[PDB]
RNA sequence: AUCAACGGAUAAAAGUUACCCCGGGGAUAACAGGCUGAUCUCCCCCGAGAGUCCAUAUCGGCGGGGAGGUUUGGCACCUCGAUGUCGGCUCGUCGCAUCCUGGGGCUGAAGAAGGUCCCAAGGGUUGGGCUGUUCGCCCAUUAAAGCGGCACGCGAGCUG
RNA sequence: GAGUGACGAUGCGCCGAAAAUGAUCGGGGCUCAAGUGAUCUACCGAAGCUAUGGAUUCAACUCGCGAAGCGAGUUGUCUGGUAGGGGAGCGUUCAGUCCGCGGAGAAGCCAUACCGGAAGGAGUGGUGGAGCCGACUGAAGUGCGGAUGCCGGCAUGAGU
RNA sequence: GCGAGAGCUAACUUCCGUAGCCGAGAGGGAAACAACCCAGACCAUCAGCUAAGGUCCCUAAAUGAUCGCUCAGUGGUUAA
RNA sequence: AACCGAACCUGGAGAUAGCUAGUUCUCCCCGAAAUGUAUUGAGGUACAGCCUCGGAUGUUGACCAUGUCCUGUAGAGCAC
RNA sequence: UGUUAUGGCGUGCCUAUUGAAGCAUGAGCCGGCGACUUAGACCUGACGUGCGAGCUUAAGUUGAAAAACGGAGGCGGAGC
């Protein structure tokens with residue numbers, strides 16, 4: 019699953035900032051290839067709105 | 074420009090970002106994005122058919138600027154020096 | 168490195184207000200006066216054309232001429248020094264109706280103020296040829 | 310200042326900045342962007358060529 | 369051990385200051401401004417009923433909806449290394465929710481005299497007796513003797 | 529001789545809609561939409577992301593060196609900041625040691641476009657007229673814009 | 689902002705809970721404007737893409753395209 | 769003896785001052801708190817919470833998923 | 849390098865604060881003066897050196913363009 023940070027963590031709740039950290043994203047634009055497992059899929063759903071998700 | 078120029082120029086000695094190839098000669102080739110060197114008005118990739126040659130002239134340091142930063146009533150004052158590293162290149166090219 | 172200045176070029180232009188809605192005519196003038204297609208294109212100085220206006224009297228106005236469109240000149244210390252004309256009431260000085268729309272759309276600085284000197288308004292048609300001894304290239308609105 | 314000198318010339322040939330730059334984007338080949346205003350200011354003949362090229366890649 | 373002021377200062381303890389003093393506080397009150405608008409001022413909806421009869425010429429029970437910011441407040445935001453405070457006088461200017469004049473509609477408007485509402489801020493809006501008075505009551509007039517804002521307008525302008 | 533009427537729903541608009549220095553949606557001006565519902569691209573736009581160069585923090589991976597430990601060296605990574613904590617240094621006086629300098633011109637003063645990542649430090653000229661840089665180590669009465677700060681000189685108010 | 693009490697389902701009010709920002713946060717936007725929207729500034733560039741916001745003229749960029757609505761300047765003061 | 773709710777001068781004396789002011793070169797790294805309990809306490813202070821530096825441990829921390837237990841709010845209901 | 853015109857941008861400094869261009873505080877200007885120190889055979893921690901299961905001396909004595917002597921005493925060494 020291709021993930022990219024499109025929105026800033028500033029002004030977003032602690033947990034959502036903590037999730038974006040767990041996904042390995044540090045800057046807006048940071049894109050990475052991601053695992054298709056309940057835990058990794060769950061993190062991505064938890065910051066769904068801050069990310070541009072491919073497939 | 075954003076390092077690695079272009080355009081029809083008449084063989085001038087312009088200054089750009091550092092080029093690694095030390096001393097004189099070194100020789101550099103540039104893609105070219107537009108030209109009028111022969112009245113032919115050609116642009117983009119069709120300009121890539123052509124390539125400008127330029128010789129490295131001098132490696133240098135820019136004029137001394139001072140980084141001054143200040144925030145009121147928060148006792149914040151910062152003075153730090155700066156000099157921008159460059160490369161002078163004499164254009165020759167096709 | 169970007170391109171520098173040339174001034175020895177003052178271009179005169181004739182614009183007709185007839186039936187043109189004020190604001191829409193104003194925009195055109197205000198733009199040619201500052202720099203639209205711009206000669207050297209630089210903002211540091213006055214590059215704009217000179218705009219002569221004809222038939223100032225016949226300028227168009229929508230829902231309100233007699234209504235709402237109110238000029239509001241408010242005089243020296245306000246010992247009730249609050250004077251106000253209607254737009255129909257500018258059957259007095261119509262050459263001002265264009266002027267106040269144009270200056271209104273121009274910068275307000277030292278240079279800006281020197282810009283109104285380039286706007287020459289006249290209420291007639293074939294007769295306003297006063298400030299028309301130099302060139303006078305005619306430009307229609309749209 | 311550059312953007313200003315651009316749709317000043319783009320409009321001179323019946324175009325505009327929004328439109329002219331979109332064409333030069335569509336004709337990928339054009340990556341000019343920087344010093345596209347010098348062409349507009351100093352070389353009109355050459356600037357037309359770019360307006361013509363943009364009009365094509367768009368329509 | 370009502371060490372109950374309950375983590376309990378000494379075994380052992382009240383007042384007063386306009387004769388007051390120092391260190392501070394706009395961390396906190398009085399004035400004024402600010403936010404609010406309960407209270408206050410005004411306007412509007414409805415129509416019980418009053419009006420010989422007829423709700424609406426006038427008046428409007430019980431109830432309802434707003435406006436204003438002139439009252440008493442609420443709150444405590446700049447000002448406590450100082451923003452002088454009532455009333456008079458002097459000098460003005462502004463709002464109109466108009467006291468007089470000006471124009472109108474309705475009238476339970478014959479006329480004359482009016483009532484009420486609409487438009488209207490151009491000018492005008494008296495002199496005294498009582499009280500520090502603002503106010504208010506009174507005398508004598510008047511076209512009328514308006515209501516409110518301007519730090520409850522105005523003390524580097526005067527009074528006190 | 530042709531459709532005509534009553535309830536309701538809902539979009540946008542109308543009345544209701546009076547405040548004190550001069551008015552206004554920021555203005556100009558806009559319905560010949562520059563208002564407003566729905567849709568669609570395109571461009572502008574930040575210190576955000578990117579390009580190119582360069583420095584720092586930590587970390588692992590090389591090698592200098594009798595060993596840590598610290599140099600350099602790539603690659604990744606970091607670097608908004610008040611109280612505060614930690615690190616590396618600049619500058620002044622005095623001292624000890626070394627190296628020197630000076631009447632063919634010391635310090636101090638004055639000017640300056642040069643250097644260093646900063647505190648800072650040189651070159652040159654001018655003035656001065658007899659003392660004095662640089663380095664290593666030691667020690668402090670060691671760095672000022674504030675304190676209604678202290679001393680002194682000189683301004684403003686004013687040719688009042 | 690949300691969840692409550694006090695208050696008049698007043699206050700730029702007070703007092704808890706909770707999330708964010710300011711405090712200690714520069715930069716764009718909101719005319720101006722600690723806080724709201726966007727976004728967290730290592731330094732240099734007369735390069736490029738975007739966000740929130742924008743694209744008549746002041747003022748960067750469509751006086752864009754289609755079907756509609758509103759003629760009151762409504763837009764650019766609230767109610768029965 | 770030109771300021772008397774207790775004169776003046778010198779000393780104790782650098783009284784005390786939970787208060788006001790002031791606190792001076794540079795760059796680099798991290799970076800708070802205005803909360804809890806107690807207090808003749810309430811603009812003071814103790815301990816904790818939160819910062820930083822050195823050391824030890826060295827994945828125990830963070831987010832997300834699955835499993836499992838706990839709860840009487842929102843809604844709702846009328847059996848008390 | 850000095851100066852100048854026009855254009856863009858642009859709310860002195862310090863202090864005190866939730867919040868300062870603030871019509872809150874301070875300051876006429878310049879020069880100089882001017883605020884975290886010193887003591888203690890005191891306690892506790894870092895770093896460094898010397899010896900090391902041991903480590904040190906105090907007063908003093910003797911020399912001194914200079915240091916030697918002096919184990920009285922002090923600390924580790926066993927706790928409850």
Ligand SMILES: [Mg+2]
Pocket residue numbers: none
């Ligand atoms: Mg008050």
Ligand SMILES: [Mg+2]
Pocket residue numbers: 399453
């Ligand atoms: Mg008073």
Ligand SMILES: [Mg+2]
Pocket residue numbers: none
């Ligand atoms: Mg006065």
Ligand SMILES: [Mg+2]
Pocket residue numbers: none
């Ligand atoms: Mg001073």
Ligand SMILES: [Mg+2]
Pocket residue numbers: 767
């Ligand atoms: Mg209501």
Ligand SMILES: [Mg+2]
Pocket residue numbers: none
């Ligand atoms: Mg004292």
Ligand SMILES: [Mg+2]
Pocket residue numbers: none
């Ligand atoms: Mg004070």
